[PDB]
């Protein structure tokens, strides 16, 4: 019948702070070799990844780092740590597309070793999502939002300047088949057709990426123009080496990498028909970070609490 003030209840709030960088130059704070991960049984937290502040913070940090460096540079793993009185929640559900509810919540103090890599049309050297293929977007109905494809298995890319850029044909074909079947699962009927970029300049048309020294702008249209009909008939149009003839912008070096993510965009066909045309896009570079930051949110501890009881 009377209130009681408890100092010690496990209550958190969803505020936001200015997290500080950590490293294992502007320099950062220490990165510990252990997690405070503690599973919170019997709780479900309503996550959200499109309303995160960490992405903007890391975009600012990357911009500042590139300004300070300026060629090229060696990226390093960067941890993000929260100040005293705050915690980083983490989602463990494997089919979590990025938003909505979650289970198996675990609390942590500092994130893992994110790599600030900038690439277009192919998320290179990214973290590998397990289980199945992941498709994420902001507003899927709209055709003005880039679709992010998280791949289950890596695909090797090997490119060398004497300029060649080589991929395995069979593995990439299987990966595209998986992407097509997943997208057909997400899009009822409406046989999917893949196309290249339409009319951009020599900078947006091609796949632009960075490795040792120079910038590689690579004509990708030779690895597209496939089709995926309704039932099962994904069929494309030699040798297992597929090569990209492409150009260099500012020898005998090779930079190997993985293709772990796709950045697609849905063409505004307007007319219905029975086809949805997808072309690789770009524009934003905050998506390069959102693939490994879709499970972290920052929570504020509110230790005080009140509760009624028979305390006389």
């Amino acid at each position: 019948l009377w209130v009681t003030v408890y100092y010690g209840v496990p209550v958190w709030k969803e505020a936001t702070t200015t997290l500080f960088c950590a490293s294992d130059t502007h320099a950062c704070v220490p990165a510990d070799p252990n997690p405070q991960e503690m599973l919170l049984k019997n709780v479900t937290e309503n996550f959200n990844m499109w309303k995160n502040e960490m992405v903007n913070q890391m975009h600012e940090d990357v911009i500042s780092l590139w300004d300070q460096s300026l060629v090229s540079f060696d990226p390093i793993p960067i941890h993000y740590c929260t100040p005293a009185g705050y915690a980083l929640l983490k989602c463990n559900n494997k089919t979590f597309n990025g938003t909505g509810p979650c289970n198996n919540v675990s609390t942590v103090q500092c994130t893992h070793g994110i790599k600030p890599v900038v690439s277009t049309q192919l998320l290179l050297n990214g973290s590998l999502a397990e289980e199945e293929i992941i498709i994420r977007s902001e507003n899927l109905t709209n055709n003005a939002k880039t679709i992010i494809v998280h791949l289950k298995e890596p695909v090797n890319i090997t490119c060398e300047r004497p300029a060649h850029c080589n991929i395995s044909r069979s593995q990439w074909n299987k990966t595209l088949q998986g992407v097509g079947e997943k997208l057909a699962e997400l899009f009822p009927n409406k046989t999917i057709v893949f196309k290249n970029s339409s009319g951009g300049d020599l900078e947006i048309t091609t796949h632009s990426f960075n490795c040792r020294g120079e910038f590689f702008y690579c004509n990708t249209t030779d690895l597209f123009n496939s089709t995926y009909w309704s039932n099962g008939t994904y069929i494309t149009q030699s040798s297992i080496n597929i090569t990209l003839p492409c150009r260099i912008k500012q020898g005998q070096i090779t930079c190997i990498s993985n293709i772990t993510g796709l950045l697609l965009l849905r063409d505004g066909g307007k007319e219905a028909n029975g086809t949805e045309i997808f072309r690789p896009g770009g524009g934003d570079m905050r998506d390069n970070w959102r693939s490994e930051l879709y499970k972290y949110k920052v929570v504020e501890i509110k230790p005080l609490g009140v509760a009624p009881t028979k305390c006389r």
Partner: antibody
Amino acid sequence: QVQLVQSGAEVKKPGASVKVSCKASGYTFTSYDITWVRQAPGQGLEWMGWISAYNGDTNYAQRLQGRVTMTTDTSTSTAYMELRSLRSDDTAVYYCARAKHTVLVTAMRWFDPWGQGTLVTVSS
Amino acid sequence: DIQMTQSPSSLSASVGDRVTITCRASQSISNYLNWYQQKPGKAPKLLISATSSLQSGVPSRFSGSGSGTDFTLTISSLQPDDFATYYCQQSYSTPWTFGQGTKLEIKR
């Protein structure tokens, strides 16, 4: 924080030359480009061109054949724009802005900050 | 060259009303298109980039939509500080042509 400061409004004779300065503050001037755009009394903004503060490359409009010369000073971080052979239709307010990044060039494609603008009036 | 054609030249409405500005292109430009707001006297400022992909601005009052060859800027409620001219600029190809602009009036 980040601001571009222009020169005062000038009046010039026909056939003369006009030189306008643009000072940048609050950021690393060598890490972006600088573009200039004119607005005549009335309606409409016409893109004159842009130049790189790091490489020094310049790209002008096709109508402005050779009447436009554009340079930078890194130590003072100031961009200078020079228009020769003025015509009676050249009276306009000129604004200096930054175009994009130099390296990460496929993401920012907007003119983020703008100067107050310099009014250039030609008359006899 | 790619041309920018803004549907309205001048429109008037009341405070809190929703005004839609339509900007069209002669060629497909994917989703590369920015919007500038020019107050009288002052230089125009960026308000929506690539259909709302900015970093610090974009107050929760403007919105952008559309892709391909037509695009739309939508207001939720007009306010007295909105007297300005809006311009749609392309960023697809080197000719970064602007729109002739639409002057927005608010009725009182």
